[PDB]
């Protein structure tokens, strides 16, 4: 089994709208495609003994073991590679169960689709499933060592990409509130919201956290000075720059019950909390001396943490260090083993509490209390095994949020405001949080910028608090948006033209409008990037941009099939047409399948939004039954039964009638403008330009723009040369015209042909046809030219010469002579300055239609003739 191609999808896609995270593997069954399990002895028993959990897999049978009801009756490795990749991820804790297998191309090539949690772990499991499955169709087993190492790699791959718990907490609430989020390319930042409403976070810091506040909070001397000048209670203390002045400092502080700290801040190191004797001060000093606040009065009480988010109190918890108690006449080592077996204790974040570890530091803490491991405690005596509280070292946290006195609430909020920090943790020492700090003689010890949350969202006693909700409420205040409008445009033909017009209309309201097309990425007429900018990577440039208010995006099937949509949902989804272009590519062979790709846009429109469908197109109108959104329709025929049935139920439609482009809203008709007065439409002679204009007008209308704005936008819009090169460029050369265009699929040849038919001038000449990379549609082109032009000259011998030489021209000649063999059917082959220069063979007011391989040359040569 060989893997030919792998795609990773991230967003709504062809296989599923909801299953955003999928891996699609193109698997080549060189062997096995001819051997449906029964032909592979041992391939049932080996599979179940290697992976015994594969009973939880269901297939067509809706049963436990439904997978295993088959296997012996093979699936030609569909299902088996798929189910193995899914199970290998489940075995390491990643939950994913969606999957599908479909045969493509020539026999033996399959598309295997499975769900992933982590992108690299997902791809790894796929490759591993293929190796496991290929060993079991060679031999009857798979060595355990080659299974365990793969499970170890999956566990590491899924660990390295994990978000820390403080970011998981904010992100989970953001999803509940429908706020979109993205990871950024630098410094582990996460973006919340689109365009002008975006915010950024990093762990517990946000876009609202100021630098002056955060730096002050990290300066212990600075913090103390600022707070005591505000009337806030803080510890009494002094400074010694590593001189043996300890004995003098206690004279200002209050005697021996003091705290000695390293002068600098380098984790909880070199600190003695309760110094009772001179020689202890010296030992504390010798450790303090290791670093670059050295004698503070010691205050009695518990260590309380107060969380304040926007100048408002959110949560309070009491912290206690790891300890054991006199739970009967047992020794300390016995008590530790007794309580360290508690089911709520374990490693990491897989538990509430963690394990108590006896080390040299536990021994040192116990010696100061007069105890050691073999000591027996008096009933209810408590012995501490650590100097400070921390859940990660085996301590506990008790929620006391509802027991805090109103005056203490007021003081804590004032502290955060004085030091200038939005999200802050305040460390308070007090014997009783329910009484005012001035009465209990409590103090504020530390103010911490960007605090963690485990102790408030997963306390060991008391009720858990939703800490994230108050954070998202300051970033995205009630009543405000987190998204900008998104208008997504798709369909086989007309996307770029529709996209530029729609962006032009929104721009008349004075907003910043960003858009992407196949030519470039633009913001308010400035070009950001050039080249084919359709697809999800370009949509991301606009959505991440801090200045954009409206996004208009043309969407192509290449981007959808290769990586999914970039935005998840949108306000307006426009589908212009479905036609037989790009068939055979991307495993889509039929028109019915192509329609399933295009329908992705209609199916992601938010229920409060609209889908805009073409009622004159039978594949597109039919999408109306999948759409959860409201549906609006457009047409070139006011009597289309769909439109009539729809407006009679008070829907909205846009139609072309009586020379006007108008909107039907229930019983009322709103005329916008005349087709002949809108410059993009060639005097009303180009029906395909009219249809593109109706779609743009209707999308603007249903999304709330006024009619006058729409009128102004259509009247001033242009598609001249060098703005839209190769797209209906009509050149005026005295009493003569030439048109440069660039059709691909047949619909574009018919659309141009109708413009030509309306040309009430003289001869209709055409100077070309298709290149060598088209399929067998050369005859169809010849058939189209035959009934539209009276001067048909063939130049299909281009410079690229993808296939042989002049055979393309020979097929065009065969086609054109099939329908109307009376149009001077010359074949000249050259198309540089030979056929595209021979314009003097056409009389006054005739029209020359050019279909060049290269537009750049066609519009250069036409200028050599000095056009108006």
């Amino acid at each position: 089994m060989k893997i030919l191609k792998t795609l990773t999808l991230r967003g709504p896609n062809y296989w599923s709208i909801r299953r955003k995270k999928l891996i699609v593997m193109r698997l080549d069954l060189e062997d096995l495609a001819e051997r449906p399990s029964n032909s592979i002895p041992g391939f049932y028993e080996g599979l179940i003994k290697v992976l015994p959990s594969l009973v939880e897999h269901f297939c067509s049978p809706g049963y436990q073991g439904g997978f295993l009801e088959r296997v012996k009756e093979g699936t030609y490795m569909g299902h088996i590679v798929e189910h193995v990749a899914l199970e290998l991820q489940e075995l390491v804790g990643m939950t994913a169960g969606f999957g599908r297998t479909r045969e493509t191309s020539t026999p033996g090539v399959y598309n295997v689709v499975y769900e992933y949690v982590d992108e690299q772990a997902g791809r790894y499991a796929g490759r591993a499933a293929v190796r496991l499955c290929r060993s079991l169709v060679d031999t009857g087993d798979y060595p355990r060592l080659e299974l365990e190492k793969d499970l170890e790699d999956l566990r590491d791959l899924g660990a390295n990409s994990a978000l820390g718990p403080s970011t998981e907490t904010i992100v989970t609430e953001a999803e509940a509130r429908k706020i979109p989020w993205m990871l950024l390319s630098a410094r582990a930042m996460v973006q919340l919201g689109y365009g002008v409403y975006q915010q950024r976070i990093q762990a517990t810091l946000s876009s609202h956290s100021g630098i002056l506040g955060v730096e002050l909070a990290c300066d212990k001397e600075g913090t103390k000075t600022i707070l005591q000048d505000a009337g806030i209670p803080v510890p009494r203390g002094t400074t010694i720059q590593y001189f043996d002045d300890l004995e003098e400092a206690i004279n200002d502080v209050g005697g021996y019950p003091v705290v000695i700290k390293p002068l600098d801040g380098n984790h909880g190191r070199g600190i003695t909390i309760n110094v009772r004797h001179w020689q202890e001060a010296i030992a504390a000093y010798d450790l303090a001396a290791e670093e670059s606040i050295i004698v503070e009065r010691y205050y009695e009480g518990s260590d309380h943490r107060v969380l304040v988010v926007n100048g408002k109190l959110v949560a309070v918890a009491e912290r206690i260090p790891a300890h054991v108690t006199g739970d009967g006449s047992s020794t300390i080592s016995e008590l530790i083993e007794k309580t360290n077996q508690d089911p709520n204790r374990g490693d990491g974040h897989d538990n509430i509490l963690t394990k108590i570890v006896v080390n040299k530091t536990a021994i040192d803490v116990m010696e100061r209390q007069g105890y050691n491991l073999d000591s027996v405690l008096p009933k209810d005596e408590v012995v501490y095994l650590r100097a400070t509280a921390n859940l990660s070292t085996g301590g506990i946290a008790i929620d006391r949020t509802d027991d805090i006195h109103p005056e203490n609430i007021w003081l804590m909020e004032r502290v955060a405001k004085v030091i200038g920090l939005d999200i802050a943790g305040i460390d308070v020492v007090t014997s009783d949080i329910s009484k005012p700090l001035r009465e209990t003689n409590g103090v504020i010890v530390e103010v911490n910028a960007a605090p963690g949350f485990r102790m408030h969202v997963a306390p060991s006693q008391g009720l858990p608090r939703n800490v994230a909700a108050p954070v998202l409420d300051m970033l995205f205040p009630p009543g405000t948006p987190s998204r900008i409008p998104i208008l997504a445009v798709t369909g086989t033909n007309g996307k770029t033209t529709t996209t530029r017009l729609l962006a032009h209309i929104y721009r008349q309201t004075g907003k910043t409008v960003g858009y992407t097309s196949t030519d470039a990425i633009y913001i308010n007429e400035y070009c950001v990037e050039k080249g084919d900018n359709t697809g999800p990577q370009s949509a991301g440039v606009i959505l991440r941009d801090p200045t954009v208010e409206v996004a208009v995006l043309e969407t192509a099937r290449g981007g959808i099939l290769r990586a999914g949509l970039a935005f998840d949902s949108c306000d307006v989804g426009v589908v212009l047409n479905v036609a037989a272009d790009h068939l055979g590519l991307g495993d889509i062979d039929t028109i019915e399948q192509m329609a399933k790709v295009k329908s992705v846009i209609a199916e992601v429109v938010d229920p409060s939004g609209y889908a805009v469908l073409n009622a004159d197109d039978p594949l597109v109108a039919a999408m109306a039954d999948k759409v959860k959104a409201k549906v609006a329709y457009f047409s070139m025929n006011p009597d289309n039964p769909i439109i009539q049935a729809h407006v009679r139920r008070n829907g909205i439609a846009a139609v072309y009638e009586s020379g006007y482009l108008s909107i039907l809203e229930g019983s009322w008709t709103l005329r916008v403008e005349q087709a002949k007065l809108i410059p993009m439409t060639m005097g009303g002679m180009a029906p395909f330009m009219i249809a593109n204009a109706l779609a743009a007008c209707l999308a603007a209308f249903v999304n709330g723009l006024d009619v006058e704005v729409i009128r102004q936008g259509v009247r001033t819009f242009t598609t001249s040369a060098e703005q839209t090169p190769g797209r209906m460029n009509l050149f005026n050369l005295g009493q003569h015209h030439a048109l440069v265009d660039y059709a691909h699929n047949p619909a574009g040849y018919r659309a141009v042909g109708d413009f030509v038919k309306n040309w009430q001038g003289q001869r209709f000449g055409v100077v070309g046809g298709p290149g060598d990379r088209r399929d067998s549609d050369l005859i169809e082109l010849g058939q189209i030219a035959a009934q539209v032009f009276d001067r048909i000259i063939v130049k299909e011998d281009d410079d690229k010469r993808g296939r042989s030489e002049g055979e393309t021209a020979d097929l065009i000649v065969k086609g054109i002579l099939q329908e109307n063999p009376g149009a001077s059917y010359e074949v000249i082959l050259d198309e540089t300055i030979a056929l595209n220069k021979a314009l003097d063979q056409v009389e006054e007011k005739g029209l020359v239609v050019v279909f060049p391989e290269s537009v750049t040359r066609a519009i250069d040569l036409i200028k050599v003739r000095n056009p108006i």
């Binding site: 762990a203 943790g425 910028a449």
Partner: peptide, 4 residues
């Protein structure tokens, strides 16, 4: 430094 984070989670102070």
């Amino acid at each position: 430094d984070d989670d102070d």
